[PDB]
Amino acid sequence: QVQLRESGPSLVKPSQTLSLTCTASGLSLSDKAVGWVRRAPTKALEWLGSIDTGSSTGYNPGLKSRLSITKDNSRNQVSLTITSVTTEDSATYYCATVHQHTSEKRTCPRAYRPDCAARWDCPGGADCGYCNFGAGSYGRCTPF
Amino acid sequence: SGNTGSIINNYYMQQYQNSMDTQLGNDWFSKLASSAFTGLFGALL
Amino acid sequence: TTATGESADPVTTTVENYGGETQVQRRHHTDVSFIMDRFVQIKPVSPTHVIDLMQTHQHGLVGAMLRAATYYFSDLEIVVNHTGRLTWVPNGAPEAALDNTSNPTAYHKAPFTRLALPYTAPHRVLATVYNGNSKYLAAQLPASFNYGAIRATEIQELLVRMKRAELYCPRPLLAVKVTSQDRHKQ
Amino acid sequence: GIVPVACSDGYGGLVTTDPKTADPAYGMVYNPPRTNYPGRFTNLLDVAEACPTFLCFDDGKPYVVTRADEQRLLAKFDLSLAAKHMSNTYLSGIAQYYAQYSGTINLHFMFTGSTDSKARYMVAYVPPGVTTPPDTPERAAHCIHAEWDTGLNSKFTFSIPYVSAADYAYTASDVADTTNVQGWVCIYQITHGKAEQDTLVVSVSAGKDFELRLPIDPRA
Amino acid sequence: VLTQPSSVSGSLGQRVSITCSGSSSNVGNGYVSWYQLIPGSAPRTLIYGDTNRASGVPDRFSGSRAGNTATLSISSLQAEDEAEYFCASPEDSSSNANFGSGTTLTVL
Amino acid sequence: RILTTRNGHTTSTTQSSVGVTYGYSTGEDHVSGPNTSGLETRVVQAERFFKKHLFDWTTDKPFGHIEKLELPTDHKGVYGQLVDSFAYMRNGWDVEVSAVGNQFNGGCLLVAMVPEFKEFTTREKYQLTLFPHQFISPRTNMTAHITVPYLGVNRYDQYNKHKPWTLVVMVVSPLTTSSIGASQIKVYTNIAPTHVHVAGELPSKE
């Protein structure tokens, strides 16, 4: 139940740099990072990029030229900067909690394993070789 | 016979190697497989 | 003998050209079923190690003489210096059924276990070079190119002997590179 | 002098499947006689090809019921004996222990429906390296296939051939994408005469020349 | 873009739902949390990390998840639960945490 | 020394032949196998010759500049249709390579069919003559004819997954061009598939 707040100007003009900020305080937004989103009018969901503690900002490519952010930890405040609004870009700015952290790797094929190829072909970039004795999709070995 | 690949008259007698068989006075699942109707039932073309 | 040359038809000039005569040839030691009957060590070896050859050294007497032929069919004889029960499975078997103790399993003896396992791959004759796109690079010979796998606990040495070998389609044999000196001088 | 045996170091240990004989420790015993005892089978294939067993299909049923809509593809499966449809059959049960098989596989379809409901089916053996077809025409006068119209004799036997590169093919298929070493076998219902909620029990047997080889022992 | 419904309605005391639908690239490796968003006014997390909640959460909202989508469980729908509940699930294509955008939670 | 080789309804006639070099056999092996189960049908319309362009024999090219051709190569003819519609087939490669030369330019080109071709390390180029092969020389014969029986691990091999025979042409002697002689010697081939058997009819796209 970490203490969050959404903050910024409410009645503003289009075609400017959205300058909307939030205060997200407990550990669930401090090992996890800050979230930036809105929803459009009578439409489906909307999402805006976000930053963890690493200082690594990233945004959805849809508006890349007119999206830009940063992060601050001392004042429990983070900043959002979205340039060049359009009239179609109308929704709620109240949510800023982005708990999500990236991680990516794919597990090996039905008969394949890490060093169970330590046998047929051992040296190379493709390490996840082949287990059950017999013709396999890639009988020698594969890369992930 | 079975797995046995020996090519020699075995050392010990049959009586002491295996247990002897009595008889009174076969192979049904090969008779079945042989008796099986192969081919068609109607006229080919 | 001033042959057509271009025809590449085999031409073998005897010594009878300059009044010398041709002597008697006893070519046993350069036979195929004879030069491959010796034991060729496979290194490095470890547990759950396939007994498939071509893992013989490329330069060995039985490694190079084998890679000097595209297709080779032979009955493998094994000699393993293991530390536990050594299970062997046929050419195609699940790696899961590797140690069910129903597949030939030689119990540890004081000396290395010496087996004569047959050639069990489904193909006509195996191949040293495949030149085939990845089934469903070229580093990969098909999985069915092995003679079966052995899994003892700690396998320490593994030797391999090709009985009744038959080689087909000869390839380059490639004797050792000589640089600067006229002869190799060893 | 005595004979100089000079025993070889290298061999003489216990192989589990070696051809030797044990040493008789008990004197001769005449076991009770069993002459012509009923039901003896010598070869597991002369029993497997003698009595066919059913396949498993959707929701674990042996039959493949008539489709509910235009869909003509009743059921399809890979030819590998380790297929999901063949998991419960005796043929695959005994092919579990062997390394590689070869030759034919007979499929037995017997229409189990009323007299008022006719139907006309088609089974097509689709070859390796290709994706198995959705409409029945894609397979007509393509591959090796058949057609039977349910009449007085319900059973129909289709001998799935053995077409492959290698002389033998592995029984336990280890990936190779969707396809196994061999191709698929699909069963189409090209036209059902009022043949709704009327089934086609599919069995499977060993061919006239089906053979397994290289016995093995995996955890089954 | 993540996916989420836009409509919710129920009675007092009964169990109404909230869901966080996604796919392989967004949910399968992304955690889901739910948050109390009033018109203009502050939020607070309720369930986070899937397995639990923080000291400071009431037990009237609860979370469940299944496969490539997530869900919330609103026990005893209350006048306190009259706020938009939002969630996120990580995006790995651009290194982000894709949000599901929350609903107008009207109490009958 | 003319030689009128003819495959199917298409024939090739050369007046500078030096003979035909059969490789590894004088005839193909039995086409009937247990795997096919007598379902293999021979196709006589796939024996028509097809012409494929090869690397131009420029004077600058050095010895060992191999220009291999994978067999079977992409075919838009009847043979190509068989590969698409049949899962398994086998045939004799019968590669014919002819390089037109003025005969006043002296060079040596070696054309050999290598089964299961592997990229050479450039030390096996000297030992590359241990294969069915012929030598193309402007001074003697401008056309080289090689016939090879189909050989593979399996009796029938799917062509898309693996190709057994690849045609390789190597510049044993760098081409020397005289003022009278050709300044560049293009190279072409006449491959024909011999004893084409197919099995395993595939589903269709039509």
Numbering used by the authors:
A (entry chain H): 1 to 144
B (entry chain 4): 15 to 39, 65 to 84
C (entry chain 1): 1 to 136, 153 to 202
D (entry chain 3): 1 to 220
E (entry chain L): 5 to 112
F (entry chain 2): 13 to 218
What does the paper say about this structure?
Foot-and-mouth disease virus (FMDV), a small nonenveloped single-stranded positive-sense RNA virus (genus Aphthovirus within the family Picornaviridae), is the causative agent of foot-and-mouth disease (FMD). As the major antigen, the virus capsid of FMDV comprises 60 copies each of four virus-encoded proteins, VP1, VP2, VP3 and VP4; VP1 to VP3 form most of the capsid shell, with VP4 lining the interior surface. In the current study, we isolated a NAb (R50) that neutralizes FMDV serotypes O and A. We determined the cryo-EM structures of FMDV serotype O (O/Tibet/99) in complex with B77 and F145 scFv, as well as R50 scFv in complex with FMDV serotype O (O/Tibet/99) and with serotype A (A/WH/CHA/09). The final resolution of the cryo-EM reconstruction was estimated by the FSC 0.143 cutoff to be 3.90 Å for the FMDV-OTi-B77 complex, 3.68 Å for the FMDV-OTi-F145 complex, 3.94 Å for the FMDV-OTi-R50 complex and 3.49 Å for the FMDV-AWH-R50 complex.
